[PDB]
Amino acid sequence: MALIDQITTINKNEFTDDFLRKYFELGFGSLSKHDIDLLVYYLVKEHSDLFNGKTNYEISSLLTITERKLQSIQMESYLRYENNSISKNLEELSVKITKGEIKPEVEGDKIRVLIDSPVLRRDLEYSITSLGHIVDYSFNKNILSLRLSNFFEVFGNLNIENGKELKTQVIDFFREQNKWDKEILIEIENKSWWIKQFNTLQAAVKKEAAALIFHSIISMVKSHI
Amino acid sequence: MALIDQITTINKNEFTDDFLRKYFELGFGSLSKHDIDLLVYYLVKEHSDLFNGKTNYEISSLLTITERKLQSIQMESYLRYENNSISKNLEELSVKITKGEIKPEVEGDKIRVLIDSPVLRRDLEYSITSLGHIVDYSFNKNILSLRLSNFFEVFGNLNIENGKELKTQVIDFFREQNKWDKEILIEIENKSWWIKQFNTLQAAVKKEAAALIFHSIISMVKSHI
Question: For labelling, which of A15, A158, B43, B142 has a CA lying 20 to 30 Å from the CA of B194?
Fold first, then answer.
């Protein structure tokens, strides 16, 4: 079975102990098939490394189910059997960016972020839309697209975790890169600035700018509940 | 949970390994609730001592299910996941009699045997009714009642495992006990013999006679496929 030996490590004692406690909570035969499928997904995720570092495409292939079914299973099981703060999920998103597992990229006046985890996607969307203002964004499958000019105009004044204003931290990045790149004016609330001036920069400056921008946006959202 | 700590020993490694192999045989989410309930029953029975030495009443109480449901689950799970010969099940029945876990008792012209296991009950009934003749017997719940006079008249000539005829082995028992009990004629194919003469014996002779008779009947049935 390509499945059970793809498991390279698993705490079999607590897989068994946990399964028995939850299968038998209301008595033998009390859980529905769907309840048990959520339990099994949780048990493999909590007590093995099977899903570790794998994309949704890989996990769905491993489980022999569609990506759409996997997303429902992942969310329903997380809600049933796990508890995380929005703060911890936002921080996990941030760390994935620092590690390069998620690579934000700017195109025109939009920053785009592939977020494969439905749990992280849910908490980001909820938290970023709970700041008192409608947010200019959309999702293309699992890719968040966020309008830059409008975001900084509307939310640029809110503090990030290190106390500085969001717009301040992003502007300060562009100044430093002006030290080794050809100098540009900095107008982050300007749609045409992103479209023409930002587009001029070297692909590696733009890559790094997008990671810092999204790090700072997450940091701003974490600072505000 | 009165359940999971009633487990005094369990191979948790193979409980986990076995569950994963069978849960995932056709892919995640392919097994019905009923399929999974049969699997779990088999897994607890194969990989723990939870059910060991317990009556159906105790197991059903442990599982929070009726005795009728338990019997269906036990049979369906055995058929799905286990394999035993009729010969091995008949021998297990025999050993339970020697151990005193099952105590055959004669009343009138009938010998009665409580058989709690639906698996053993099924193989006994099938094997004992596959000897070419209709058998005079009935079940009261899990108590087999077998008519003595008619059984020895019809099947008394068939060999038991040690080569002797069934009627011969049973008669030889009554002779030995005549050595220390008051002597009786021996007419095991006679209904009124069981009802009046056998009834005379001491309760401990009758207890031992019933175990030897049923041991020999099982031995006869094992000798004939």
Answer: B142
| CB burial string A171-182: b at 16+ within 10 A, e below | bebbeebeeeee
* Region at B179 (left for phi over 0; alpha for psi -120 to 50; beta for the rest): alpha
* Residue A111 three-state SS: strand
Burial class (CB in 10 A: 0-12, 13-18, 19+), A205: middle
Q: Which of B25, B33, B72, B74 to mutate to test the interface with A (most CBs of A within 10 A)?
A: B33
Query: In chain A, what are the domain boundaries?
Result: 12-81, 87-223
Q: Do B28 and A4 touch (CB under 8 A)?
A: no
A27: left (phi > 0), else alpha (psi -120 to 50), else beta?
Answer: left
Q: Determine how many CB atoms are found less than 10 A away from the CB of residue A96.
A: 17
DSSP string, A13-31: HHHHHHHHHHHTTT-TT-S
The alpha carbon of residue A119 is apart from the nearest alpha carbon of chain B, in Å, by 20
* Helix, strand, coil tally for chain B in percent (to 5): 55, 10, 35
- Cβ of B4 within 8 Å of Cβ of A20? The answer is yes
For this entry, resolution in Å reads 2.1
CA dist., res. B190 & res. B174, Å (int): 14
CB spacing of A4 vs B21 below 8 angstroms: yes
Terminal Cα-to-Cα distance of chain B (whole angstroms): 45
* Residues of B with Cβ-Cβ distance to A64 under 8 angstroms: 26-28, 30
CA dist A100 and A40 (Å) reads 30
Best B16, B45, B68 residue to mutate vs chain A (most A CBs within 10 Å) = B16
Are B13 and B49 in contact, with CB atoms under 8 Å apart? no
Q: For A4, which of B7, B24, B69 is closest by C-beta distance?
A: B24
Nearest CA in chain A to B18: A4
Phi/psi at B34 (5° precision): -60, -45
